[PDB]
Amino acid sequence: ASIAQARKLVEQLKMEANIDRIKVSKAAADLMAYCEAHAKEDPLLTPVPASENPFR
Amino acid sequence: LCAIYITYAVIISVGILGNAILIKVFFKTKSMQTVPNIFITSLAFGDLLLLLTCVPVDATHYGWLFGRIGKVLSFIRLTSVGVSVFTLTILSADRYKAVVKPLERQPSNAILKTCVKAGCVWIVSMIFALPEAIFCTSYPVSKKLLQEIHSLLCFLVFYIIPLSIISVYYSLIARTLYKSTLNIPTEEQSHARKQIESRKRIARTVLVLVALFALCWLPNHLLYLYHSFTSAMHFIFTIFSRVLAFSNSCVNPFALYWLSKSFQKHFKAQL
Amino acid sequence: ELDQLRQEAEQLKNQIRDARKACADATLSQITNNIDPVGRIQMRTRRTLRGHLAKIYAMHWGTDSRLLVSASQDGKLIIWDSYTTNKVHAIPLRSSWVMTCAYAPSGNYVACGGLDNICSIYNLKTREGNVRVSRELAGHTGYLSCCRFLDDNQIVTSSGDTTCALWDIETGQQTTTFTGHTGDVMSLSLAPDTRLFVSGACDASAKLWDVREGMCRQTFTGHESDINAICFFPNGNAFATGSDDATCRLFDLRADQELMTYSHDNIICGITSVSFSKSGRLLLAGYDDFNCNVWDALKADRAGVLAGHDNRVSCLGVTDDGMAVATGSWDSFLKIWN
Amino acid sequence: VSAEDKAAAERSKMIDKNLREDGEKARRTLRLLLLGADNSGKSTIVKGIFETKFQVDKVNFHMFDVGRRKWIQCFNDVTAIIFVVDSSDYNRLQEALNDFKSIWNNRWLRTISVILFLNKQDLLAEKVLAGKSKIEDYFPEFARYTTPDPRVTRAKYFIRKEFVDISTASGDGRHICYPHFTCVDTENARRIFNDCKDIILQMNLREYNLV
C-alpha cells in the first residue's frame, strides 16, 4: 500500500540528490550573458521604428 | 418684490451645480459609464443648456439688450426644452424595459444604438425649434390664428404626449415594484427587509417624479395658452410660472442622487 | 518500516537542502547590481480583438507570430489575425468550459480542454474548408489546465488529477504519464529545444520532467500557495513561477534553487499568467487586480503596467519574435501591446 | 486593397455575423450552478461535467453539476447558485452548514445569489415525529429555541434559521439567499425561475442607478 509509494518517493528524491549542481554565481553570470546577447533582438525592451512595425 | 428673485437665483444655481457635478462625476468615473448613463448625461446637458439660456432672458428683463439675431437664444431655448423632455421620455422607456421586463435584456455592447437614439432625439428637437425662426416675442400681432396653432402645437408636443408616456411607464414601474416586493425571503432581515424598503422607496420616488414633472411644466404652457387666447399684477405670476418651469430640470439630477447610493458616494467624492 | 523510511527521507531532505545552500555563493541582485536598469516602459494597445462573449481563459500565439488562437467560456474557439483583426476561424466547442488552448508549431492543428477532462484537436486545414475534431484524447481524471504541442503528433497535457501525460494524436493513447505532484497542476511550459517541461501545481511546488524518459528530474519549492502560471526562460535553463501568494519567483535548473522574488507590498492578489520577452530580460505577469505588471527579470523592480482591462487578466503571451504581447482577460477582450 | 484582402474581410464578416447570431441566441440563457452535496437528492431536484437543460415560461436555463477550490472560478458569471441539503440527517447537517459558509464567503461567489433547497423534508417530519433522534444532540441551541404538527415546523424553521443566519453574517446585501423547502415536489423549476427573475430585476435596478 503506502510502502510502495514511500519507496517510489525515496528513490525519486535519491536520484534528485545526486545531480550535478552549478554554483549560483556563474548561473547569474550566464543569465546576464544571455540577456545581453539578445538585448537588441527584443523590440519590447528596445522599441523599433514604426516603419517596419506591423502594429501601427 | 425682490424676494421672488432670490428663490429664482438659488433654484437656478442649485440646478446648474447639480448638473455640473453630475457630468463631472460621469466623465471622471468610468465605473458608471454604460448604456443607461448616456441618456442621464444627455438630460444633464439639456438642463445645463436650458438654465444657461434662462439666465440671459431675466437678466435682460431686469427693448432688449441682446441683438435681433441674438433669434438664436429662442432657438437654443426651444431645442433645449425639446431635448430635455424627449430624453425624459426615453429614460422613462428604458427604465420601464429594465424594471418590468428584466429577463429580456439588451444593453451590453449597444452603445451605438443608444448614441444613435440620443442623436436622433437631439436632431428632432432641433428641427422642432425651427418653426420659431420667424421672430423678443416669438410672433407678431398679425399672426392671430398662426400663433394660436403654434401655441397649441407646442403645448401638445411638449406636454401631452411626453407626460402621458412618462406617467404610464412610471406607474407601471411603481406597480411592478410594489408587486415584486412580495417575492423576497421576507424573514431573517439584513438581506430581505432592505430590498422591501428599497423597492417601495423607488416606486414612491418615481411617482413623485411624475407628479413633479406635471406640476412644474403645467403653468408655463397654461400661461402661453392664455396669452395666445387674449400686464396688471400678472408679472409675479409669469415669474413664478417660469421658475416652476425650469425647476423640473433642476430637480432631475436630484432624483438620481436620492435613489442611488453609489451615485451619492460619487457625488460626495467629486463635491 | 514506515518510521525508518520517514527518518531517512527527512535526513536526505536535510542533506539536499544543505547541499543546495552550499552551492549558493551570492544572490542574484549582488551580481546584477551594476546592470543599467531598463527603466519605465510604455505599452499601447495596438489592437483590441473583439468578438468573444464570455470571459477568456487562455490564448496562444502561432509560430508565424501573425495568427493566434483564443478560448472563451462561451464555448467558442476563435483564431484571429492580429495584423488586421480579421477572424480567420471560429470553432464551436462541444464543452463551453474550456480552460486552455494551444497552437501547433506547424500551424496545422489547435487544441483545447477544460472541465470536460478531454483534450480536443481540430484540423485547421481541410479540403472542404471546414474545421472538425481530428481526435479526442481521454484518460485524464481531473480538468485540463494546460496543453502544448511538442510536434504535429505529440502533446503534453496537465490536468487537475495531479498528473501530467504525454499523448499520441495518431493513436489517442497516453504514451507516458508523469506522476508525483500532490495538488492540482495549473500550468506547464515546454523547453525551447523540446526535451524537458516544467509543471507548476497547487502543492506550492514545481517539478521538472523529461518527455523521453518520464520521471521527475528535479523538484523546486519556495512558494507558499498555489502556483497558477509557469514558463521557461528563452535560453531554456530557467523558469518563472507565478503563484497565488502575490509573488513571482525565478528558478534555475543548474543551481537547483530559488533565484529572485518578484513581489511588492501594494500587490496582494495572485498571479494569473507569466511570460518572458524575446531576450528574457523582461518578465510580464498577469494579476487578479485587473492589470498586467511588467517585471525586469534581473533586478526584480517593476518597469511598467499593462492597464486597460476592466476585468481579470487571465492569460498573456509573447510572440516568437517578441514583437507583440497579447493579453486576454475576463472582459472577453484581447489586446495587442507593442 | 487587394482581392485576397477583400476575401479575408468577407470571411471575417461572415464569421462575425455568425458569432453575433450565436451570441444573441446563447446569451438569453441563464446559467445555474447546481452545487449541493451527495445523498442530498441534488441530482433529482428538477424533473466531469453534467449539464442539464430545462425551459420554463419560454426562458432557457442551463444547470451545471460537477462530479472544488480551483474550478469554482469558472462559475463567476452564473445567474444563481442552487444549493441542496439533506435536512433529514443531523450528523452531516453541520457539514452542510460549513459547506454553505465556505460557498457564501468565497471571493469569486461574493456577488452571486444562492437559491437554497432544504431537501427531504418528509424524512425530516418522520424523524422528528419518531423522537428516536433529537436535534438537541447535534444542535444544543434547539432546546432553547422557540418558534415565532408544531414540532415539525419548529425543527424545519430552526434549520432554515441556521442557514439564513450563516447567510446574513456577510454580504451586506450584495447577494441574498432564497431558502425553500423541498420534498418529490414538481414546482422547483418555477421557484428557480422566480428567484432568478428577482435576481435579474435587482441587477437591473443596480445597473440603472435606481438603487
Curated annotation (Swiss-Prot), chain A:
Lineage of source species: Eukaryota, Metazoa, Chordata, Craniata, Vertebrata
Stated name of the protein: Guanine nucleotide-binding protein G(I)/G(S)/G(O) subunit gamma-2
Naturally occurring in which organism (per UniProt): Bos taurus
Disulfide-bond pairs as recorded: none
Tissues expressed in: Adrenal gland and brain.
Record's keyword terms, sorted: Acetylation, Cell membrane, Lipoprotein, Membrane, Methylation, Prenylation, Transducer
Signal peptide annotation: none
Parent sequence residues shown: 7 to 62 of 71
Transmembrane segments: none
MF-aspect GO terms: G-protein beta-subunit binding; GTPase activity
Membrane topology according to the record: Lipid-anchor
Gene (UniProt): GNG2
Functional summary from the UniProt entry: Guanine nucleotide-binding proteins (G proteins) are involved as a modulator or transducer in various transmembrane signaling systems. The beta and gamma chains are required for the GTPase activity, for replacement of GDP by GTP, and for G protein-effector interaction.
Major location (coarse): membrane
Swiss-Prot record, chain B:
GO MF: bombesin receptor activity; neuropeptide receptor activity
Compartment(s) of residence: Cell membrane
Extracellular side: 58-71, 227-239
GO CC term (a single one): plasma membrane
Top-level taxon of origin: Eukaryota
Main location (coarse class): membrane
GO terms for biological process, alphabetical: adult feeding behavior; G protein-coupled receptor signaling pathway; glucose metabolic process; regulation of blood pressure
Keywords: Cell membrane, Disulfide bond, G-protein coupled receptor, Glycoprotein, Lipoprotein, Membrane, Palmitate, Receptor, Transducer, Transmembrane, Transmembrane helix
Membrane topology according to the record: Multi-pass membrane protein
TM region positions: 1-17, 37-57, 72-93, 114-134, 154-174, 206-226, 240-259
Expressed in which tissues: In germ cells in testis. Lung carcinoma cells.
Cytoplasmic side: 18-36, 94-113, 175-205
Protein's UniProt keywords contain Glycoprotein: yes
Family: Belongs to the G-protein coupled receptor 1 family.
Oligomer status and interactors: Interacts with C6orf89.
Function statement: Role in sperm cell division, maturation, or function. This receptor mediates its action by association with G proteins that activate a phosphatidylinositol-calcium second messenger system.
Protein's recorded name: Bombesin receptor subtype-3
Gene that produces this protein: BRS3
Entire-sequence positions represented here: 47 to 345 of 399
From Swiss-Prot, chain C:
The protein's role, per its UniProt record: Guanine nucleotide-binding proteins (G proteins) are involved as a modulator or transducer in various transmembrane signaling systems. The beta and gamma chains are required for the GTPase activity, for replacement of GDP by GTP, and for G protein-effector interaction.
Originating organism: Rattus norvegicus (Rat)
BP terms from Gene Ontology: cardiac muscle cell apoptotic process; cell population proliferation; cellular response to hypoxia; G protein-coupled receptor signaling pathway; phospholipase C-activating G protein-coupled receptor signaling pathway; positive regulation of cytosolic calcium ion concentration; retina development in camera-type eye; sensory perception of taste
UniProt protein name: Guanine nucleotide-binding protein G(I)/G(S)/G(T) subunit beta-1
Assigned protein family: Belongs to the WD repeat G protein beta family.
Location of Phosphohistidine modifications: 264
Record's keyword terms, sorted: Acetylation, Phosphoprotein, Repeat, Transducer, WD repeat
Domain of life: Eukaryota
Gene3D superfamilies recorded: YVTN repeat-like/Quinoprotein amine dehydrogenase (2.130.10.10)
Single GO cellular component term: plasma membrane
A molecular function (GO) term: GTPase activity
WD repeats: 44-92, 93-138, 139-179, 180-221, 222-265, 266-307, 308-338
Post-translational modification: Phosphorylation at His-264 by NDKB contributes to G protein activation by increasing the high energetic phosphate transfer onto GDP.
Curated annotation (Swiss-Prot), chain D:
Effect seen on changing residue 205 to R: In PHP1C; significantly reduces receptor-mediated activation; displays normal receptor-independent activation
Region (G3 motif): 61-67
G5 motif as annotated region, ranges: 182-186
Entry superkingdom: Eukaryota
Chain spans, region G4 motif: 115-122
Positions with a binding annotation for GTP: 36-44, 65-67, 119-122
Cited InterPro entries: Gprotein_alpha_S, Gprotein_alpha_su, GproteinA_insert, P-loop_NTPase
Record cross-link Glycyl lysine isopeptide (Lys-Gly) (interchain with G-Cter in ubiquitin), residues: 127
Localization per Swiss-Prot or TrEMBL: Cell membrane
Residues bearing PTM Phosphoserine: 170
More details: This protein is produced by a bicistronic gene which also produces the ALEX protein from an overlapping reading frame. The GNAS locus is imprinted in a complex manner, giving rise to distinct paternally, maternally and biallelically expressed proteins. The XLas isoforms are paternally derived, the Gnas isoforms are biallelically derived and the Nesp55 isoforms are maternally derived.
Subunit structure: Heterotrimeric G proteins are composed of 3 units; alpha, beta and gamma. The alpha chain contains the guanine nucleotide binding site. Component of the TAS2R14-GNAS2 complex, consisting of TAS2R14, GNAS2, GNB1 and GNG2; within the complex interacts with TAS2R14; this complex plays a role in the perception of bitterness. Interacts with CRY1; the interaction may block GPCR-mediated regulation of cAMP concentrations. Interacts with ADCY5 and stimulates its adenylyl cyclase activity. Interacts with ADCY6 and stimulates its adenylyl cyclase activity. Interacts with ADCY2.
Natural source organism: Homo sapiens
